[PDB]
Design an enzyme around this catalytic site. Sequence first.
Site, short mmCIF file in Angstrom:
data_model
loop_
_atom_site.label_atom_id
_atom_site.label_comp_id
_atom_site.label_asym_id
_atom_site.label_seq_id
_atom_site.Cartn_x
_atom_site.Cartn_y
_atom_site.Cartn_z
N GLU C 288 0.94 -1.11 0.00
CA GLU C 288 0.00 0.00 0.00
C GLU C 288 0.98 1.16 0.00
O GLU C 288 1.74 1.34 0.96
CB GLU C 288 -0.85 0.00 1.27
CG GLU C 288 -2.05 0.96 1.21
CD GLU C 288 -1.79 2.28 1.91
OE1 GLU C 288 -1.08 3.13 1.34
OE2 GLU C 288 -2.30 2.45 3.04
N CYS C 322 -2.09 8.68 3.95
CA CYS C 322 -2.11 8.29 2.55
C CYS C 322 -3.49 8.61 1.98
O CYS C 322 -3.69 8.59 0.77
CB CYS C 322 -1.84 6.80 2.42
SG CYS C 322 -2.80 5.75 3.60
#
Lengths: 516, 516, 516
Positions: C288, C322
């Site tokens: 990720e 993020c």
Amino acid sequence: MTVEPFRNEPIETFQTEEARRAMREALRRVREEFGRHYPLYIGGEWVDTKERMVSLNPSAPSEVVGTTAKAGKAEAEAALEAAWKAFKTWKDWPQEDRSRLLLKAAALMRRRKRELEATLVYEVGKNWVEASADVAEAIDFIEYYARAALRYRYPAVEVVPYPGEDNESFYVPLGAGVVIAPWNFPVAIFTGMIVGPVAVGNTVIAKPAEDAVVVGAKVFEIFHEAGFPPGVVNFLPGVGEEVGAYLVEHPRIRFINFTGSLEVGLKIYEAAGRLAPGQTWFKRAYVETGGKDAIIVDETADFDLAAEGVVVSAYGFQGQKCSAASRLILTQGAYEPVLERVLKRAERLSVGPAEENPDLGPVVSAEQERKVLSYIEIGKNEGQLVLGGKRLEGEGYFIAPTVFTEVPPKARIAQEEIFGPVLSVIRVKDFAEALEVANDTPYGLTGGVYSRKREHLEWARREFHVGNLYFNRKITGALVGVQPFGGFKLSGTNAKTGALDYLRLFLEMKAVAERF
Amino acid sequence: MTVEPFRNEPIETFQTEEARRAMREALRRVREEFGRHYPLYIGGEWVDTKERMVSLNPSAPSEVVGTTAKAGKAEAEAALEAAWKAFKTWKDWPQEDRSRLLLKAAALMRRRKRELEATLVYEVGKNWVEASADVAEAIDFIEYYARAALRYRYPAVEVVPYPGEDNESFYVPLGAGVVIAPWNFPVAIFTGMIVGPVAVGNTVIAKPAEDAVVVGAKVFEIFHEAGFPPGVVNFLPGVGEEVGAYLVEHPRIRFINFTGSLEVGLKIYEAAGRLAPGQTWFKRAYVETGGKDAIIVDETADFDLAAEGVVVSAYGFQGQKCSAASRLILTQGAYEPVLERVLKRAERLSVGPAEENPDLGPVVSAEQERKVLSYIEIGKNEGQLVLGGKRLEGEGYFIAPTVFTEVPPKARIAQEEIFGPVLSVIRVKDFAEALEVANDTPYGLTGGVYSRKREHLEWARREFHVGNLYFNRKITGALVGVQPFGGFKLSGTNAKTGALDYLRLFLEMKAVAERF
Amino acid sequence: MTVEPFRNEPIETFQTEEARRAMREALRRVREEFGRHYPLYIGGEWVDTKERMVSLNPSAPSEVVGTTAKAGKAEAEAALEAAWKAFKTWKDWPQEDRSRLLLKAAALMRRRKRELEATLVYEVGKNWVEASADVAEAIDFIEYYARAALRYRYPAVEVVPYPGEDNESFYVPLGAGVVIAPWNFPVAIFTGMIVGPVAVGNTVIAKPAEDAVVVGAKVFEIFHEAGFPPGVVNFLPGVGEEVGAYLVEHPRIRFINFTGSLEVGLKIYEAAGRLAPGQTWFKRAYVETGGKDAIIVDETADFDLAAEGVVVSAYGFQGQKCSAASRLILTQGAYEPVLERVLKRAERLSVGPAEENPDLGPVVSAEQERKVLSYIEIGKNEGQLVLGGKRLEGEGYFIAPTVFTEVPPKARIAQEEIFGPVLSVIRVKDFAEALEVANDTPYGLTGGVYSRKREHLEWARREFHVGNLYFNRKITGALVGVQPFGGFKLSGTNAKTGALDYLRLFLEMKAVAERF
Ligand SMILES: [Cl-]
Ligand SMILES: [Cl-]
Ligand SMILES: [Cl-]
């Protein structure tokens, strides 16, 4: 599912200071708003007209709550063009997209909850709690139908497979139809009859009742803010026998969703059965036409519990409900004990301007007042008046809670829907005869039985012929999802609102096979 | 749900006169078309090239079975543009529509079953039954995936609800990818690797193995007639190292679905892990890379049943299967009884032109022949040759069923995939040692155990580390839906074909929330 | 199930006196604990080392929150031996047993909730609520994965039956893998990436981020008290490019679970694709890698609601997420109204030591401060600075909320992940162009749209290419189970955390057939 399990919107009781504060402010803002004008809503835009509809305050009829534009045949045609044009694409929206639209509408309605309730208090004379239950029910219809509609998504039909072929059956919406609503639940039933059909892909032209045009306009403000595409939902306040009848008989109206009097429902159903010139389909007509609801009480019941439920059922919103207990059938052993409790309870009921949150507000209009007082005069010649039976002092249409006893089962007041605060008490020998009298009317909507004897309750479950039966509790206030609402006989076509089956009424099936 | 439950396509045994008659006619029709040239298939049309690919009959290599165009980098780019252009709308097709297209393709393939089997016989040397199983499996992949794909339709993800919000998660395809297929199952695997990704919304560029370009083209004739939109599926016969590698390393290839040798699989997986210049995603590469499969037999087994299964597993299609039994692990008590039976059966196997339906046809090519003969020479220095080990008479690449005994577990022929009719026999003390030897290889695809002792079978169920394990039956011929196919360790990425999980590999998930 | 339906752990707002009291005491005890030393955790025991890792207080970097041992290659090897040895038996634990272990761990974490939040405030500079959401998320991962894992219990695969055989397919864990976590969600993501794999039978070596080693040690104190068998989970604080890279490239590491920068993720994914010397499997790597998240606002939106959501999304935890909104795309009609509201809201944000519960604490480290200030300098040459853009006075790494407007879509500040309190405003003509600009980045993690127009929302649902999309609400704070979290393109491999699918990534399938 992508949302939480359905739950009924809580009905505000206004016992806390916060609730009273919120409601007083909402009532004040609505009041300060009296006289406002609302246009028609056609093709995604508000459209005004020269003529207008006037909505008065039943608690003080010299006050104009507001006015709306008035739809005639020209506006009806415009709405029809917009609705059919909208159907062309609205029918192709994924069901998930349509349901999310309803969910948005419900969220917006919930946020304007107090305001809508206040508008009901002033426009139709509901006390605070009756107003709260009405709006809560409307929210429930939107939330419930949004989810229920997903159960019909493409391709929902269970079919038998065949070798070498794909056999797919699925539902498709009907088209553009007309909704003709009543004034007693101008937010709830108005909303329900509209969003049900719309959720599955149909488009609608809605015709609110004359006495509740303002609250109907406010509902459309919510639809507009929600973002329903132009033409999907249209608002046409006007005269029923004029623009309403015009739409019902029109060759291009696919379906009719109606709630109101049996007199009008009978005309609509007959008209729907005719093929208008150039019509290319068999019209579907769903009608909910009221009833002559009775509550039965036998000698084994909790008399105090029964008297309380009877009073709530008979006088809630001045008995202006298709579910109202207008008949009280008491067995010999329960006659005196229950009648005395009902009278002592009913004589304490307060009557006054709805804004004051009395037990009973006024009847909705002068015409309604005339009709109710007229039935009271008839009652005086059929049964024994033992409470009220008169108009109260004031500009508003106030009628005192009324009770007639020793009423013959076939008396007009024991057969015809009065739609007012008038209770007819009928004495019978036993439960068997109670059921006899209960079933012997042209209607079959709601009914109730107060009894502790299991055999009588289970007997009624199978033989008390009404669509909505309640044991040891009020027979009004059916909750969406919990109690599918709709009756038998002349109470209508049994289109159960707040039930999965309701949506199927606005769909037709297609079977497509491909041989590979 | 709209089609009959999945069932495996019956594998023709040719026991009836009608079946043989039909095959003879298919063989005649196919050989009468040996002169045909099959172009590339790009963007819905056949596109020819200057250069070409030549396909020989491995049972008579001087005979050409057909020729195809040859894709270079320019054609790869053309296919790439067409595939991404197609993806843009193919991804939006309702899953029901994509599934029907596949079902149509399956129906067409089923109708051309004999023709395809006959083509496998002439082009890759499969006898009748091996040919039939290959085509039946391809048909199975289409049927199975068409149905499996529907389990992922919008919106298929199970999520936890949150108050005041709609939370919807659903799957979406990846885009355009390349499929690089093997020559040993040129219809089944070639078809499966293509239709799996395509079924759920992806577009594919298929690169058939050099040895089976003709039958690969015939599969595309079916795709074309089925009506896949221009660009959805593309046919690019060419040199693996050239056009295959070009696509694998391309920055615009979203995924790679590969089945073949470990050598190439390792290169592809490594290349997939790199970010090519301008690449905007992490590439997914699924690789099935063969194995060094073993069958274990203990002293409690039915030796005749075992010897039968061993022969079937080791020499079916000349042992050119990733699932072929190339190792026979025997415990002390079973060694002699089993080995003698395997030898007696194997020595009775016929070898010759595939069209005459021998037990064994030829190996696929001169290169394959050279590789197998080389391992045979290596084996002569590692173990004891007791059967076969020679090239047989004829221009066709006929190699005799071969058996080596006393082979050390770590010997090259007991570790490396030969992909030919060569069985290495290893003797072990007991079942525990048998399992240890079975597990001690870099592979983990198929494996089998012949035994009547429940404790040994259940022990293997847990400790014999292979993706596809079989008890008391052959270890080859995994059936779609019944036996998810895929291995462990260097046998690949465990992408189970013919299983629901396979399609998940070609989808990514999106979660969308709306706060009302 | 044997436990109650999953529910998300409530996120503490600290509005009540009880909550503030509990938090003040937790903050004080953690503070009084500064300087404490935590060893490595290998094979079920704490193991110290000569070298150490130092964790500073970003709000006052002269203060050492604590130190930990430092893992080098020798400790990595020790952990690998312990993890593989543990796998041998851990893989055989009934799933019900493993899930109960996680449930115990969750219960212990919940009881130490305030303490863990306080540690986050001091070690990584999160204000009180950000700290509460982090720990709540970690608890959610454990609770969610414990239940989700049971859905994969033996034998979970749906297969097609075959006459005379038992065909059983089931999942088995992969083995020992390495987890490499980020510093921005040092309890949540650290916990999630570890317990997911472990729940289904894998064993893990966890490598916490340099700036969050202390809170990582506290998580392991919980694992130890919970009773995970020796070797099942191992704690290896150390330098990423050293012990982290060593493990990633190691031939005996079965899988890699990584969350962090795209730069490191690209290196890990490439390394994972290579076959290290002696490696016997194809490595699985889940990464990720963050994103460049945008929120779109059109002229139909509730501007006040949008400005509020944008500020929360852009500056929550100083924009070090993020999922942070680092881009604000406004259509012409919404540009001025929304930008003015965002600026008025952002200019009121407080910045100070995290312990004071300011709106924004400091960035996590000097290096992070350098990177963010550097991007601000670049921004001054690409767009128009209209708010902040400077460092604040104090020892701590305080940066004022920053806003650049009139930013070119392809500017570095509108393309590269800054990971700081820096918002880039982009003006576009309409929704179509808004979607264009939104999708035009190498990433695809989170995104949002503020709009009342159903057609724009439903259009975005299908075309705004991000893994996590939100309408009319913040785009940060994805809840476990509710919103599967993971993106597209260079935001990673789309391994959806807090979703059933996540666990499948750490399992491989086996198909075992027995012919009777
Ligand atoms: Cl009945
Ligand atoms: Cl195993
Ligand atoms: Cl998307």
